Amino acid sequence: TXPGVTXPGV
Amino acid sequence: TXPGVTXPGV
DNA sequence: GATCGACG
DNA sequence: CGATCGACG
């Protein structure tokens, strides 16, 4: 996720 | 699929 | 991070 | 055609 907590996705 | 019956996938 | 989202 | 298809941070 994110960042943070990428995306998703990427 | 295949082709035939792409891949999967692509 | 959370049973992750977006190319024949 | 196919089949709850399968493989970039």
DSSP codes of every residue in A1-10: -BT---BS--
The residues near B8 (Cβ < 8 Å, ≥ 6 apart) are B1
Q: Is B9 helix (H, G, I), strand (E, B) or coil?
A: coil
- Judged by C1' against the alpha carbon of A2, the nearest nucleotide is C1
Return the ∠ at Cα A9 (arms to A6 and A10), rounded to 5°. Answer: 60
Closest CA to B1 of B10, A1, A8: B10
**Cα diameter, chain A:** 13
Q: Taking the C1' atom of C2, which residue's CA lies nearest? A: A1
Q: Is B8 helix (H, G, I), strand (E, B) or coil?
A: coil
The CA distance from A3 to A6, in Å, is 5
Experimental method reported for this structure: X-ray
Q: Taking the C1' atom of C7, which residue's CA lies nearest? A: B10
Resolution (A): 1.7
Q: Which residues pair with B7 in a beta bridge?
A: B2
Q: DSSP letter at B3?
A: S
**Cα diameter, chain B:** 13
